[PDB]
Amino acid sequence: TDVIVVGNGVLGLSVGVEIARTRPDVRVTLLGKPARQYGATPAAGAMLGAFGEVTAHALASEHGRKKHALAVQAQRLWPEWIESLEATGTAADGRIKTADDTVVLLNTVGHSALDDANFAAVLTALKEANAPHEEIAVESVDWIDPDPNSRPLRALHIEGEGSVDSGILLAALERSFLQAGGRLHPVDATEIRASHGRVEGVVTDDGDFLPAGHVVVAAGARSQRLVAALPGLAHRIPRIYDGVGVSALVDTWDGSGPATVLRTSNRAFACGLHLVPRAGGSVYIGATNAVCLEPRGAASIEETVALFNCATHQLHRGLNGSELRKVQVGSRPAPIDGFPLIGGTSVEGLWMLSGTYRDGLHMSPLLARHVVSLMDGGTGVDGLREFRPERDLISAWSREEILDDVVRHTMATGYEFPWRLPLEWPHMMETFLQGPFAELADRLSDTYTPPADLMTAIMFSEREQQDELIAYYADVHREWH
Amino acid sequence: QTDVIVVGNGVLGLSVGVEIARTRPDVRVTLLGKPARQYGATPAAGAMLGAFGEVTAHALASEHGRKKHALAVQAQRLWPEWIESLEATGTAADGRIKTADDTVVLLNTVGHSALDDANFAAVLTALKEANAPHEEIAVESVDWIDPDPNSRPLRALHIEGEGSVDSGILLAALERSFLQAGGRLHPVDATEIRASHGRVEGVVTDDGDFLPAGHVVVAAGARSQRLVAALPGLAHRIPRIYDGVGVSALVDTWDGSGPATVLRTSNRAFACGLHLVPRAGGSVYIGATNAVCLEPRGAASIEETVALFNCATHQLHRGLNGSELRKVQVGSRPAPIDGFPLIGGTSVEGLWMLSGTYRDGLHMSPLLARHVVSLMDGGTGVDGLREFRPERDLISAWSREEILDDVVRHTMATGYEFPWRLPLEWPHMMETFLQGPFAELADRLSDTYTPPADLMTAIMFSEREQQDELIAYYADVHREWH
Amino acid sequence: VIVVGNGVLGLSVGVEIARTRPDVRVTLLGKPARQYGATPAAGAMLGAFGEVTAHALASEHGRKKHALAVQAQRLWPEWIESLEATGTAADGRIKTADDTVVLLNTVGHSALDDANFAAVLTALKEANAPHEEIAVESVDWIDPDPNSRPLRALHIEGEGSVDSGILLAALERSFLQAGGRLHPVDATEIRASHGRVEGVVTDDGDFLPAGHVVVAAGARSQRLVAALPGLAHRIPRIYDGVGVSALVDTWDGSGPATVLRTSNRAFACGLHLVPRAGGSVYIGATNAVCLEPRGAASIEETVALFNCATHQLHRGLNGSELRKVQVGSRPAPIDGFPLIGGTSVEGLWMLSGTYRDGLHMSPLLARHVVSLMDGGTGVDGLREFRPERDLISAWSREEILDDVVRHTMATGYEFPWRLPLEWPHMMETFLQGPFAELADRLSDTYTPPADLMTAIMFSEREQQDELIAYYADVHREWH
Amino acid sequence: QTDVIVVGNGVLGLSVGVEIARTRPDVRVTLLGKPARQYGATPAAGAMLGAFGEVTAHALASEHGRKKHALAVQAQRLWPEWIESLEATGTAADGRIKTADDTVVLLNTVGHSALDDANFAAVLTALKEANAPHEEIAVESVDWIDPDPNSRPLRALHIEGEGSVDSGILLAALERSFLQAGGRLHPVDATEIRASHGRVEGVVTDDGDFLPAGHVVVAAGARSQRLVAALPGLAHRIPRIYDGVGVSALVDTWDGSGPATVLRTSNRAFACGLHLVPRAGGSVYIGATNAVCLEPRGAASIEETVALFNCATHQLHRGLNGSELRKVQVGSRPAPIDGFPLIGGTSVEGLWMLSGTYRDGLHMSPLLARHVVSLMDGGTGVDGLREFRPERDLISAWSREEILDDVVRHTMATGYEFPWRLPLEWPHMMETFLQGPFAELADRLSDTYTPPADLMTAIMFSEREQQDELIAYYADVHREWH
Ligand SMILES: Cc1cc2nc3c(=O)[nH]c(=O)nc-3n(C[C@H](O)[C@H](O)[C@H](O)COP(=O)(O)OP(=O)(O)OC[C@H]3O[C@@H](n4cnc5c(N)ncnc54)[C@H](O)[C@@H]3O)c2cc1C
Ligand SMILES: Cc1cc2nc3c(=O)[nH]c(=O)nc-3n(C[C@H](O)[C@H](O)[C@H](O)COP(=O)(O)OP(=O)(O)OC[C@H]3O[C@@H](n4cnc5c(N)ncnc54)[C@H](O)[C@@H]3O)c2cc1C
């Protein structure tokens, strides 16, 4: 029985590996090119972020608390998953794990309404989960050499929350996939073919047709656009946008690196500052985030400067004199309703693994096992049912909660710069931002409100793009009510 | 009576008092006001004899603004003989009224291009049109200045015969000249003007006394309209005047030096600006902030003092940083609600007004004095003052659209003048989000009247009750004149 | 008895003498103008734990000064009761706050602010003082710029503030009630012969006889006594620690319920707000050691004071009305420690060189000197601070050179500056050599503390050479 | 042999290769170098045809600097025919070498007055002295630019006929023209020049081969002196060349637009500068940082990338902020230790050098190529270039005092160009404390030689062992020539 996995990121390869190992009866073919155009995974550090990803806003919603529980469950799978992938290689392939622990730093280069609230939410989430952690003296954090005006005054050590080399992970997944009898076919899917409510297979961009009983779409930010061509699915699969992220590999001045992940809490519009250790005198610094209504594969000047400025001031001034090896750009799959698209469709044999935004790589072994269990007639992981791909848009927050959040995040872009303004200006800007965002939210839809990250993108998009989204929301409402 | 009472002891009241006393030796002229000069604009002034230095693109884009500028140019011609006539009543030991003959206008980048670049070009054009002597000079040739390099000027304009006076020595010379001409000083305040059968009878003072008069000249600064508005019908016939609260400072320089000229920028956000006026005895005057306040204020805010000092130390001379602060001065520019002065006669026989002169009453004083004295003698005074008669419908010198463009530009200029450091997308975001609220305010205040930018920002950030009282005021004025 | 000086120390000792010796005539000199007066420019904080620095507590002399500050705090409640007792409700309240909050923000050098916050916490724990580290969100009233906000806060119970003006009025009233005489003239000269005080010549030409003269003339105290034979090189010099503060009427008439402060910052300046009655707050306070007196604020001092308060404490102060810029001279002793007690001249006493905390220590210092004048031994730990002494060397030259470079760099971080990231390390490297060369040139044995060392570094060559001569003459006298 | 080997495939090697191949059709010319162009200056260049734009007050204060400037002016005259002759060997699809005809020099306050104001005046003086066509223009008339108002220019200078080329299209045109003239491209590096009996024999390549030749022209950029220094005595007879590491970037503009002219500042701290060179197809070039490194570096630092982008987005066009980064480019300007190029013949028969051209070798290339080809043919080439012969005692173009003033000014300029915000006493404090250490370094390095400011800062912040090796180098040069 033929299975085609569309996409060669962490999610496609993780599901490919689990099918190939688990299902000796199926021939599994994985599509995607070595260039990995718009690929999130190669641009990732990556942090195995569960507690580090906690925000007050996320944990204020039932859907956010459910997503967090799944991130905590995923962390338990990583040690055996890494062992099983390194087992198919040798010493020369390098180590997947680059750090065991994370330090979260609190500095004043940001908004109190995000950074202070989020630091308290991380502490509360760790205490509630009984996770091992300690608030530590900043003086005890090794390696860091911040600008004194940008320095942390509080620090939180999270034990067993670490990082992987995303490049070594991708290489280990491909090697493990081939060892288990998987086939890599380096072309893109152009079209999923279906008739009589069942997948027939995939047309490739070299003109070929590949037959299959099962198609798993794990094409990152392209996943919904690929499935939306099939009858009715345009308004039944929530849209996925590009959360364009910029990161960099730097060769440090002295070849040193920190022993732990160093990070802030999530910041304005789900960007954040972090350093992930790498082998061989390299560090990863990340990572910007901007929701784009169309794909973008190149860094902007603004993104590169903000990333470098935050890292050199808030983490280590020695990075200033360090050599830039690579500016990396990738698209976090940004779901329009703020939650992932994991599981089966109304089309027999059609599955989706996408819309994982900031933490698909961390959740990958859990999500892979879930979808593979479903494909085998199992029930997979409890609590992933709410994130089924064919659904009405989730409304995880009130319009009022989102309007408060989008104004706070807008103001946070100033405080994170950090700006220097006359003291009356911030209050003036807060007062004049409220009305326009309230008017936009009211005009977009009577029922759906986009989360803050997408709402700012819509606010500053062309009138034609806003009108097309008004029509999309109206057609979704029609379909599900 | 043929007795004259001048209400007010600032530059305007004393200047008119001197001109009346010298021109009518047959009549008794009495001047009211106390030596404290509460909220007094004149003692807080440097002061610059600003004509060309006061030019803005926005002012010269209106007919009323061009008329106000023509009068400033005419006033400048009177200053040399006026000063000679005042110093003539004193001796060398009284000190010199004039502290500088010339002005240098500096162009730096610590401000909005839409104000500073437009205003510098407007000053150059106005000087050329008036055939005034001036030269664009090398910045390196400007005497004394030692700016922060990131705050330095890259262009400089020397204006010949546009100078400064010591406002304290001017006030002393005016009082001395007033007494020498037979004027009487009565150091009390007027509480009420008495009139009946369309004619002034005189003035009740705050010690309970009644002083009779055939002529009353109101030059009481920002209190002038409140004083006249008590008389029948005049409450909606005399445009309101608000307090343009200005902060300045006297500094003893580190080495006792000072520049040989006035140093200034063009007028900046909401009619503030940066200037240094030389003084004798190792002192310099630095000014000056401006904020229209709906009620009087007699104390500097922290924000005003810091902005004044920061601009002077960075843009003029870093040596001022180490210099000793002698005095923070606060005074009220009389800020007329329609943006133009109140000069001349009333529907009440013998009642005259000299007020609402905002930034340049001191500069215009010899011209305004001669104008009102000519009118009191049955003359027509100075040509082009007619539009600025005190009993009038509110002037609309600009379109609502021109004022809305100006108030947004001035708001943005408060950022660039700080100077702020922001992400590059933020200024355009703030411009876009400022437009709607200012347009909504303008539309709500009145169908016919629009306050100038300086007052519009004060109204925007005032209490709902103060906005509603202004809506009622505008409606009552409309009723009275239409 | 003649007390020379009408600040907190002179009036406090005057009150204690007049109350304790009703048999003796006590006359207090000084003018209502209080030229260069430290006391009227003070908030004032009853600073014991708030004044703790890592540098101070690293020396034996610094630990002794701190112990005395802790002892002084215990005397304040009864002292205030005894002074308010001589007045009525209409005189106003001396005490303006009971408690202090210390804020830690990043608008400063880690090497000062982080070290000093840890030192304050340690000193509170060691003294068993009641205190709590609190959530910043729980600090009432404050509205900082988010980029200037505190991330840690420390509530110190029973460390409060007084209105310095109401204290001065209460001391004068209490002095008169106890039979003291106020003579509003200055002393020009102390007269002594056969190793004994005869009295004081005043600036109106008069001679006032006395068996006892107590010099509490603030920053003028040593210059006054140095005229007497040999005392020029036996009484440590006192300089002017010129301080700028301000009274502000708040936008809404509100004020905080506690003192709000940082730890001491570059060259012993600091940021604090002291509550006052009637919709006023006190903000302070700058500090610059000047080799000559200065009675006017500089532009730079006024801007630094206002900028720190509006950003780090409350943005609402920006729109608040300036009522008064105050300037006073902290008596800055050349060896960093006060001059308290008796001299080799019989009947000649000194109370001076108290720098940042003479007002706080006043009831303890007053009782000490009055005990000594009565043949007692006063307070146990004050002996090292006797006014007739060789200059104290409380720190190694190396410790002071590290401190002066750290404090110089802290003037940048406290601004706060924005510079290319290589510049701070470049400036640290190029500051070390010149300060080491200055220290080596001034003397083989004495090193001025950082606050005075920066003043000497940027003074005229003639002023440096006069100090080299002074240090050499002191060495001669004592070795 | 009569065979010629050109060692190096940058603008200078290819330009000389083309001129030899075209002028000596009888001889085999082989050009060495790899398509990677490791550390290559030319591919990282915009490039500006900078003659007047490169003028500084410091350069024109020395006789050697005035001679270098005269040669840059002469080179400009050759470019039109040179470009025609190179495009002639291609077709329409190869694209155009010339990307702009004119340059605008902008003066803003994001820099030190002691560099930017002095250099702007020096450019104006040099244009007037040369009778070159130019105009000081209104900043409002400069097309395309959209600066941050706090970073905006207040003066602008239009230089007619001073333009730019696409360095990539130039390199492709030079290779094609070299082949068309009968040149051979051998894509390997030289490891060693072989000579005996005072004559070149040829070149050993890094693939182990030996290539015989009668003539070897070394145009290996910053590697040129290290290659020749192996030959007897030449270690102390050919001035050292260091790496002037430069960072630039190609950006796809938000709307596909670009300016019609080069936009630039005068040269800034340690011979960095801000400029935008137009490119075809919706791309712009922005440059360019400069740091002398004692060892080669092939990667941009974080600091360099941020400074380049921040200056361009604030001072030229805020729209670049939202523009897509296509490429960060890094190349090594050949930085001669005595500040002047190494052009011409050696004491070794058939050995020639074209190197040490720092910021303007690409601009001078057609003149330098014709000069060396004339010398190889027994001519005297171009009149003023004999002073820049490669085998020489180190030039001392400035007094030690002039260089100590310059290095302190340039150090302070790194602050003002950031731009920093500091307490007003700090800059004077840092100036005072920088003077002593730079004077001590200069005194310790040598009794006779002083490195120019750009190299002096690199030496100041290098390891003690690197300083000691330079002291030995200077002593060995002194020994050799005195
Ligand atoms: C800057 C950055 C930092 C990050 N940091 C972290 C981190 O710290 N921790 C963490 O857990 N995660 C991190 N992530 C990643 C995040 O978890 C993502 O949600 C996750 O990588 C998504 O994986 P994916 O396989 O769904 O998508 P991708 O990784 O985008 O993979 C999809 C692949 O499919 C290919 N494709 C597209 N269309 C087709 C088609 N038609 N046919 C075939 N192939 C196609 C694409 O080229 C691509 O290679 C980061 C991402 C970014 C951009
Ligand atoms: C800005 C500032 C803030 C402060 N804040 C605090 C604080 O928070 N807490 C605290 O505890 N303390 C504070 N202090 C004060 C500090 O404690 C001082 O050490 C203390 O006030 C010194 O008091 P004194 O009486 O010795 O001097 P002063 O208060 O200066 O009194 C000396 C008096 O003697 C007079 N005098 C001088 N020469 C003669 C003469 N020849 N004859 C007669 N009279 C003469 C002077 O005019 C003056 O009035 C502050 C001081 C300043 C300047």
The DSSP-derived string for D445-458 is H-SS----HHHHHH
Strand runs (DSSP E) across D253-361, as ranges? 262-264, 275-278, 283-287, 291-293, 324-336, 342-345, 351-355
CA–CA separation, C267 and C286 (whole Å): 9
Mind giving me the DSSP string for B50-65? -SSTT--HHHHTSHHH
Count the Cβ atoms, other than its own, within 10 Å of residue D115: 25
SS3 state of residue C346: strand
Measured CB to CB, residues of chain D less than 8 Å from chain A are: 251-252, 297, 299-303, 305-306, 309-310, 312-313, 320-326, 328, 421
Q: Given the structure tokens 């190694």, which residue do they identify?
A: C396
Please, which residues have CB within 8 angstroms of residue A367's CB and are 6 or more apart in sequence? Answer: A11, A14, A15, A74, A340, A342, A353, A356, A360, A384
CA–CA separation, C179 and C123 (whole Å): 41
Produce one character per residue of A302-330: b if its CB has 16 or more CB atoms within 10 Å, e if not. bbbbbbbbbbbbbbbbbbbbbbbeebbbb
The strand pairing partners of A185, in sequence order, are A31
Q: What length does chain B have? A: 482
CA–CA separation, A289 and A310 (whole Å): 14
The angle formed by the CA atoms of residues C118, C119 and C125, to the nearest 5 degrees, is 90
- Measured over the CA atoms of residue B334, residue B339, residue B342 and residue B347, the dihedral's sign is negative
Structural contact between residues B247 and B305, judged by C-beta atoms closer than 8 angstroms: yes
Mind giving me the DSSP string for A240-303? EEEEEEEEEEEE-TTS---SSEEEPPP-GGG---EEEE-SSSEEEEE---EEESS---S-BHHH
User: Residue B120 is which amino acid?
Assistant: F
> Which numeric CATH code is attached to A97-162+242-334?
3.30.9.10
CA–CA separation, C369 and C375 (whole Å): 10
Rg of chain B taking only CA atoms, in angstroms = 22
Q: Quick check: B150 and D314 CB within 8 A?
A: no
Count the Cβ atoms, other than its own, within 10 Å of residue A240: 30
Q: Quick check: B306 and C303 CB within 8 A?
A: yes
CA–CA separation, B361 and B341 (whole Å): 9
Mutual angle of helices C299-312 and B302-315, in 10-degree steps: 130
CA–CA separation, D237 and D229 (whole Å): 8
Is 3.30.70.20 the CATH classification of the domain at C96-160+239-333?
no
**Tokens found for residue D272:** 């960095």
**Tokens found for residue C267:** 């060259």
Rg of chain C taking only CA atoms, in angstroms = 22
Q: What is the resolution of this structure in A?
A: 2.0
Instruction: Give the CB-side neighbour count of residue D209, counting CA atoms within 13 A.
Output: 10
Q: Given the structure tokens 């734009």, which residue do they identify?
A: D53
CA–CA separation, D442 and D430 (whole Å): 19
Alpha helices in B201-256 (DSSP H): 224-228
Structural contact between residues A82 and A97, judged by C-beta atoms closer than 8 angstroms: yes
Q: What length does chain D have? A: 482
CA–CA separation, A440 and A456 (whole Å): 10
Ligand nearest to the CA of A334: 1
SS3 state of residue D51: coil
Peptide bond into C44 cis (omega under 30): yes
**Tokens found for residue D218:** 């070394």
The overall longest dimension of chain B from CA atoms, in Å, is: 70
**Tokens found for residue A450:** 């986009």
Count the Cβ atoms, other than its own, within 10 Å of residue B455: 24
Sequence ranges of the domains in chain D: 4-43+168-241+338-388, 96-165+243-334, 400-481
The angle formed by the CA atoms of residues C193, C198 and C200, to the nearest 5 degrees, is 120
Q: What's the CA-to-centroid distance between C146 and ligand 1, angstroms?
A: 35
Please name which of B476, B412, B470 lies closest in space to residue B442, comparing C-alpha atoms.
B470
Peptide bond into D288 cis (omega under 30): yes
SS3 state of residue C104: strand
Q: Is C315 exposed, middle or buried (0-12, 13-18, 19+ CB in 10 A)?
A: buried
Q: Is B473 annotated as a binding residue?
A: no
Q: Is the CB of A349 under 6 A from ligand 1?
A: no
Structural contact between residues A358 and A327, judged by C-beta atoms closer than 8 angstroms: no
CA–CA separation, D31 and D14 (whole Å): 8
SS3 state of residue D162: coil
CA–CA separation, B354 and B19 (whole Å): 14
Best to test chain D binding among A301, A413, A419, A421 (most D CBs inside 10 Å): A301
SS3 state of residue A216: strand
User: Residue A190 is which amino acid?
Assistant: T
Q: Is the CB of A6 under 6 A from ligand 1?
A: yes
> What fold does the segment set D4-43+168-241+338-388 form as a domain?
FAD/NAD(P)-binding domain (3.50.50)
- How does strand B215-218 pair with strand B351-355? parallel
Please name which of C265, C108, C85 lies closest in space to residue C170, comparing C-alpha atoms.
C85
**Tokens found for residue B421:** 């450091």
CA–CA separation, A154 and A107 (whole Å): 7
Q: Is A287 annotated as a binding residue?
A: no
CA–CA separation, D218 and D31 (whole Å): 10
The angle formed by the CA atoms of residues A304, A306 and A308, to the nearest 5 degrees, is 65
Q: Which of C29, C202, C356 to mutate to test the pocket of ligand 2 (most atoms within 8 A of CB)?
A: C356
**Tokens found for residue C198:** 């005869």
CA–CA separation, A470 and A464 (whole Å): 10
- Measured over the CA atoms of residue B196, residue B198, residue B199 and residue B204, the dihedral's sign is positive
Nearest chain B residue to C294, by CA: B324
Tell me which DSSP letter residue A394 carries: P
Structural contact between residues C357 and C349, judged by C-beta atoms closer than 8 angstroms: no
Q: D302 to chain A: which residues are within 8 Å by CB?
A: 250, 308, 311-312, 319-322, 324
CA–CA separation, D56 and D118 (whole Å): 8
User: Residue B384 is which amino acid?
Assistant: G
Structural contact between residues A211 and A195, judged by C-beta atoms closer than 8 angstroms: no
CA–CA separation, B174 and B166 (whole Å): 12
Mind giving me the DSSP string for C360-427? HHHHHHHHHHHHHHTT---SGGGGGG-SSSSPP--S-HHHHHHHHHHHHHHHHHTTT-B--TTHHHHH
Q: B265 to chain D: which residues are within 8 Å by CB?
A: none
CA–CA separation, D396 and D402 (whole Å): 11
Q: A327 to chain D: which residues are within 8 Å by CB?
A: 325, 328
Please, which residues have CB within 8 angstroms of residue C353's CB and are 6 or more apart in sequence? Answer: C221, C222, C236, C238, C331, C332, C333, C337, C338, C339
Produce one character per residue of C210-229: b if its CB has 16 or more CB atoms within 10 Å, e if not. bebbbbbbbbbbbebbeebe
Q: Terminal CA-to-CA distance of chain A, rounded, Å?
A: 38
Measured CB to CB, residues of chain B less than 8 Å from chain C are: 251-252, 297, 299-303, 305-306, 309-310, 312-313, 320-326, 328, 421
> What fold does the segment set C2-40+165-238+335-385 form as a domain?
FAD/NAD(P)-binding domain (3.50.50)
Q: Quick check: C306 and B310 CB within 8 A?
A: no
> What fold does the segment set D96-165+243-334 form as a domain?
D-Amino Acid Oxidase; Chain A, domain 2 (3.30.9)
Q: Is D256 left (phi over 0), alpha (psi -120 to 50) or beta?
A: left
Please name which of C139, C132, C43 lies closest in space to residue C95, comparing C-alpha atoms.
C43
SS3 state of residue A88: coil
Structural contact between residues C16 and C362, judged by C-beta atoms closer than 8 angstroms: no
Instruction: Give the CB-side neighbour count of residue B299, counting CA atoms within 13 A.
Output: 15
Tell me which DSSP letter residue D166 carries: -
CB pairs under 8 A between A and C: 62
Rounded to 10 degrees, the C-alpha dihedral D444/D446/D451/D456 comes to -10
Q: Given the structure tokens 């003359």, which residue do they identify?
A: B379
Q: What length does chain C have? A: 479
**Tokens found for residue C59:** 């020396």
CA–CA separation, C404 and D102 (whole Å): 54
- Helix %, strand %, coil % for chain D, to 5? 40, 20, 35
Cα B143 to Cα B72, B133, B267, D17, distances in angstroms: 27, 19, 22, 57
CA–CA separation, D476 and B135 (whole Å): 58
Instruction: Tell me the shortest Cα–Cα distance from C53 to chain D, in angstroms.
Output: 25
Structural contact between residues C252 and C316, judged by C-beta atoms closer than 8 angstroms: yes
CA–CA separation, D132 and A272 (whole Å): 53
Please name which of B21, B45, B41, B22 lies closest in space to residue B31, comparing C-alpha atoms.
B21
Q: D152 to chain B: which residues are within 8 Å by CB?
A: 109, 113
Q: Quick check: A421 and B436 CB within 8 A?
A: no
> What fold does the segment set B99-164+243-332 form as a domain?
D-Amino Acid Oxidase; Chain A, domain 2 (3.30.9)
Count the Cβ atoms, other than its own, within 10 Å of residue B479: 9
> Which numeric CATH code is attached to A2-42+167-240+337-387?
3.50.50.60
Nearest chain B residue to A429, by CA: B430
Q: Which of A358, A364, A370, A387 to mutate to test the pocket of ligand 1 (most atoms within 8 A of CB)?
A: A358
Alpha helices in B88-182 (DSSP H): 113-129, 167-180
Mind giving me the DSSP string for C278-337? SSEEEEE---EEESS---S-BHHHHHHHHHHHHHHTBGGGGGSEEEEEEEEEEEEETTSS
Query: How many whole angstroms from its chain centre is CA D360?
Result: 4
Q: Is D359 annotated as a binding residue?
A: yes
The angle formed by the CA atoms of residues C405, C410 and C413, to the nearest 5 degrees, is 140
Instruction: Tell me the shortest Cα–Cα distance from C13 to chain A, in angstroms.
Output: 44
Peptide bond into A137 cis (omega under 30): no
Cα D197 to Cα C443, D202, D347, D349, D350, distances in angstroms: 68, 13, 11, 9, 12
What is the layout of strands, in order, in the sheet containing C213-215? Answer: C181-183, C27-29, C2-4, C213-215, C348-352, C339-342
The angle formed by the CA atoms of residues D293, D295 and D298, to the nearest 5 degrees, is 85
- How does strand B155-159 pair with strand B134-137? antiparallel
